[PDB]
């Protein structure tokens, strides 16, 4: 009856542990709901990912959003090479609504180390945009090749400057100094494509893979033409974690010989469950 209910709490604690292990996280992240509210961006790529809802073991990362470290924006990511696998990289910025129709000039500059000539900056995108009152807009800037150079050589990234201004030079900032602005900060959207046997006589480390050969000729199952034998193996909860198929050529006893692929016939790896 309800013996399972007691065990149910410990199954949930086990899944928690397994989730952290599949992620690659030593501890559960400590983030307040308030801080989540501040950092979660209210932008198209996140509304796309959220709106959908409403190495065998490890998790595979498809997309990474990096917020600014800590001042116009610096991005720090320990993201591990993968220029080659970095499929796309976009800087997302939100331009706040304006009061009157105004044309807004945006320039986004990569910093480089100051020299005599070409002091301070390089240039990534410059925009001229016409805004009407009441609505702000999100802009997505391709920075794939830029971001790759940063990963290839850290210390070549000093961050970026973003300027936004009207025809006369007055500033109208993209940087929001208030509690009421939530999810409105800039962010970087990067898409990437990341990817115990024993002897028959061995006294095991409990869970282990043990050899087992199935000989159809031995059972007088002569209808199977090929394989005559195969290595199935077994585990000694200690259970198979990974299996492979075999192909079989056999008589079905209906005047037909069939050649077929039989899934999950061979145990390749076992693990504890």
């Amino acid at each position, epitope marked *: 009856c309800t013996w399972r209910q007691n065990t149910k709490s410990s199954r949930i604690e086990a899944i928690k542990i397994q989730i952290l292990s599949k992620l690659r996280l030593e501890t559960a992240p400590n983030i307040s709901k308030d801080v989540i509210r501040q950092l979660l961006p209210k932008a198209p790529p996140l509304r796309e990912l959220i709106d959908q809802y409403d190495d065998d073991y490890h998790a595979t990362t498809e997309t990474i959003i990096t917020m600014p470290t800590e001042k116009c924006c610096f991005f720090k990511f320990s993201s591990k090479i993968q220029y080659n696998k970095v499929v796309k990289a976009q800087l997302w910025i939100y331009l706040r609504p304006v009061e009157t129709p105004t044309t807004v000039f945006v320039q986004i*500059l990569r910093l480089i180390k100051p020299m005599k000539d070409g002091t301070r900056y390089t*240039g990534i*995108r*410059s925009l*001229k945009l016409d805004m009407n009152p009441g609505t702000g807009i999100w802009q997505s800037i391709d920075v794939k090749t830029v971001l790759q150079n940063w990963l290839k050589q850290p210390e070549s990234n000093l961050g970026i400057e973003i300027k936004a*201004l009207d*025809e006369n*030079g007055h500033d109208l900032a993209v940087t929001f100094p208030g509690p009421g602005e939530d999810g409105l900060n800039p962010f970087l959207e990067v898409k990437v494509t990341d990817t115990l046997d024993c002897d028959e006589h061995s006294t095991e480390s409990r869970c282990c893979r043990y050899p087992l050969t199935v000989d159809f000729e031995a059972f007088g199952w002569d209808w199977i033409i090929a394989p005559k034998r195969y290595k199935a193996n077994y585990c000694s909860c200690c259970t198979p974690t990974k299996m492979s198929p075999i192909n079989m050529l056999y008589f079905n006893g209906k005047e037909q010989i069939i050649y077929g692929k039989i899934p999950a016939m061979v145990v390749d790896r076992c693990g504890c469950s």
Partner: antibody, heavy 125, light 108 residues
């Protein structure tokens, strides 16, 4: 939002001419300004650009030394002074304004979305 | 100079591509802008910073930049598109440079 050009004509080789381009509808001193021309049935050729206040001027090698660009931000007007005119200078001359304001870096790198109606100058004996 | 094929054509609804080859001093380091010019009117800017459209310009006009080359591609080809099309960029020797122009014919 408009650029209204003036002052072309026919002129003898080695002699001189001055074009005008008057702007309205935007803050004239917030933009770099250019002159571009086109010979009868040929392509566009950029001739010069000038900075917002007049302190930098760059010229195509073909007019370097003979043409001079300038501006009077108080009369909202762009000028080009042409000397030592040759027959290959004959063309329609267009004035154009930078798409971006001079408060951004490299504003003149990015292109020109404004453009006057054009002025014909013909260089012939 | 930047190099553009002298000519191009399409049928109404077809997708044409105008090409621009240049040098590392210009296109390779610097933003490309594209112009349309109808017979006896001034140029009109279609594209800037490689792939951005100014106000009033349909997204059937798109453009890109790889290395030392750029492309202007007109999807959904209307017959108003019959015109000359020019690329341009700033060269590091301090001068703006146009390409030679591409006549686009809209077989009508």
């Amino acid at each position: 939002i408009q650029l209204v050009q003036s002052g072309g004509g026919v002129v003898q080789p080695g002699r001189s001419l001055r074009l005008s381009c008057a702007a309205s509808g935007f803050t004239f001193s917030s933009y770099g300004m250019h002159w571009v021309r086109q010979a009868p049935g040929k392509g566009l050729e950029w001739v010069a650009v000038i900075s917002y206040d007049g302190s930098r001027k760059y010229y195509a090698d073909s007019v370097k030394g003979r043409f001079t660009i300038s501006r009077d931000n108080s009369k909202n007007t762009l000028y080009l002074q042409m000397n030592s005119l040759r027959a290959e200078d004959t063309a329609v001359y267009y004035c154009a304004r930078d798409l971006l304001v001079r408060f951004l870096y490299w504003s003149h790198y990015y292109g020109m979305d404004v453009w006057g109606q054009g002025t014909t100058v013909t260089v012939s004996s | 100079v930047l190099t553009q094929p002298p000519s191009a054509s399409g049928t109404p609804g077809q997708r044409v591509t105008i090409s621009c080859s240049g040098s590392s001093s210009n296109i390779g380091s610097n933003p490309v802008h594209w112009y349309q010019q109808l017979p006896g009117t001034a140029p009109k800017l279609l594209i800037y910073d490689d792939n951005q459209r100014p106000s009033g310009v349909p997204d059937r006009f798109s453009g890109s930049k790889s290395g030392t080359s750029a492309s202007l591609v007109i999807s959904g080809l209307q017959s108003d598109d019959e015109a000359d099309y020019y690329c341009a960029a700033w060269d590091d020797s301090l001068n703006s440079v146009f390409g030679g122009g591409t006549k686009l014919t809209v077989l009508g």
